[PDB]
Amino acid sequence: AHKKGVGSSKNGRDSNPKYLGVKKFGGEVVKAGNILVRQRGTKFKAGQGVGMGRDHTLFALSDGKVVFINKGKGARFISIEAAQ
RNA sequence: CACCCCCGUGCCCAUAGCACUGUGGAACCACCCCACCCCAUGCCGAACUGGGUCGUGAAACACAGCAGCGCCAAUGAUACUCGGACCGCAGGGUCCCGGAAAAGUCGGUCAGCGCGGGGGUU
Ligand SMILES: [Mg+2]
Ligand SMILES: [Mg+2]
Ligand SMILES: [Mg+2]
Ligand SMILES: [Mg+2]
């Protein structure tokens, strides 16, 4: 006549969002200590003027202007060059 | 650099790599030889290290050749597609406008640009 279940899911679950990616893009002014990429790994390597926290977070060290170096795929660098 | 060549070291990060191959030796490099100590081996001077030859340039390195491989790669067309409009009950599909791949074909390539030093041009 009717049915009695009984099944469910073992799924559903997921994890709260991890707002990643670059926050500071090609040709952008930058204050000292402004963050420029959140990333899982070495996706973007620090160049001149940019350091890297343990989160592999890239944060700029001395003001200036942001510049993206794509060195042919899998090896890429972000840097600051000050204006003048 | 005056011309070559070699040693270091860079920008470049494979159209710059690998194989096959030829050349190279006292002038730089290499193997080489010795090691009780500095120094070093999870064991061994193989490697790090130390004292120095001759000998060999065979190995390795440098340079040249080469398109077998690798890598780079068109135009043409297409896929898809912003945005204009449409058909199909629906799965799905069309037209106009611009953008426009990937894979493949044409091919292209045995790299290029520096700095310093050494050593040669009866
Ligand atoms: Mg449309
Ligand atoms: Mg069209
Ligand atoms: Mg076009
Ligand atoms: Mg060669």
Q: Is residue A79 part of a domain?
A: yes
Tell me how crowded residue A78 is: count the other CB atoms within 10 A of its CB. Answer: 25
Report residues 32-71 of A contacting strand B, contact meaning Cβ closer than 7 Å. 71
- Please tell me whether any atom of strand B lies within 7 Å of the Cβ of A72: yes
Kindly provide the resolution of this structure in angstroms, with one decimal: 2.9
Contacts of A7 (CB under 8 A, 6+ apart): none
Question: How was it solved?
Answer: X-ray
What sign results for the dihedral spanned by CA atoms A52, A34, A44, A28? negative
Q: Is residue A8 part of a domain?
A: no
d(CA A37, CA A52): 9
Q: Is residue A13 part of a domain?
A: no
Residue type, position A41, single letter: G
Nearest nucleotide by C1' position to the A73 CA atom: B13
Asked whether the beta carbons of A37 and A24 are under 8 A apart, the reply is: yes
Could you tell me the residue range of the domain that residue A78 belongs to? Answer: 20-84
d(CA A3, CA A24): 57
Q: Is residue A12 part of a domain?
A: no
Residue type, position A70, single letter: N
Cis peptide upstream of residue A66 (ω within 30 degrees of 0): no
Q: Domain total for chain A?
A: 1
CA distances from A70 to A6, A41, A74, A79 (A): 55, 16, 8, 11
d(CA A17, CA A5): 33
Percentage helix, strand, coil for chain A under 3-state DSSP, each rounded to 5: 0, 30, 70
